[PDB]
Amino acid sequence: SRAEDYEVLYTIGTGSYGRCQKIRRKSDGKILVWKELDYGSMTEAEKQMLVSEVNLLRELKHPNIVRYYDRIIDRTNTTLYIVMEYCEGGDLASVITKGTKERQYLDEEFVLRVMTQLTLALKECHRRSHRDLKPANVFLDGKQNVKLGDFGLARHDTSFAKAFVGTPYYMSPEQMNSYNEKSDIWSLGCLLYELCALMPPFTAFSQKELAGKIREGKFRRIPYRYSDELNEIITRMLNLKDYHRPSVEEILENPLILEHHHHHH
159 is in an annotated binding site: no
Shared domain check, 150 and 258: yes
How many CB atoms sit inside 10 A of residue 9's CB? 14
Question: What is the resolution of the experimental data for this entry, in Å?
Answer: 2.3
Shared domain check, 62 and 113: yes
Which of 87, 120, 144 represents a domain boundary (last residue)?
87
Shared domain check, 228 and 110: yes
CATH of the domain at 18: 3.30.200.20
Shared domain check, 191 and 83: no
Label each residue of the chain as H, E or C: CCHHHEEEEEEEEEECCEEEEEEEECCCCCEEEEEEEEHHHCCCCHHHHHHHHHHHHHHCCCCCECCEEEEEEECCCCEEEEEEECCCCEEHHHHHHHHHHCCCCCCHHHHHHHHHHHHHHHHHHHHCCCCCCCHHHEEECCCCCEEECCCHHHCCHHHHHHHHHCCCCCCCHHHHCCCCHHHHHHHHHHHHHHHHHCCCCCCCCCHHHHHHHHHHCCCCCCCCCCCHHHHHHHHHHCCCCHHHCCCHHHHHCCCCCCHHHCCCC
26 neighbors 6 (Cβ within 8 angstroms): yes
108-127 helix and 181-197 helix, angle to the nearest 10 degrees: 160
181-197 helix and 228-237 helix, angle to the nearest 10 degrees: 140
125 is in an annotated binding site: no
Burial of 177 (0-12, 13-18, 19+ CB in 10 A): exposed
CA pseudo-torsion sign 255, 261, 263, 265:
positive
Strand order in the sheet with 68-74: 6-15, 18-25, 31-38, 79-85, 68-74
CATH of the domain at 176: 1.10.510.10
Shared domain check, 26 and 129: no
How many CB atoms sit inside 10 A of residue 82's CB? 22
Shared domain check, 208 and 92: yes
| Active site positions, annotated | 132
Range of the domain at 236: 46-66+88-265
- Cα separation, 19 vs 38, in Å, equals 10
Q: Which amino acid is at 245?
A: R
* C-alpha dist (Å) from residue 205 to 164, 181, 230: 14, 28, 29
Shared domain check, 58 and 168: yes
217 is in an annotated binding site: no
- The count of structural domains within the chain is 2
Shared domain check, 108 and 202: yes
Shared domain check, 118 and 20: no
Residues 6 or more apart whose Cβ sits within 8 Å of residue 128: 56, 59, 60
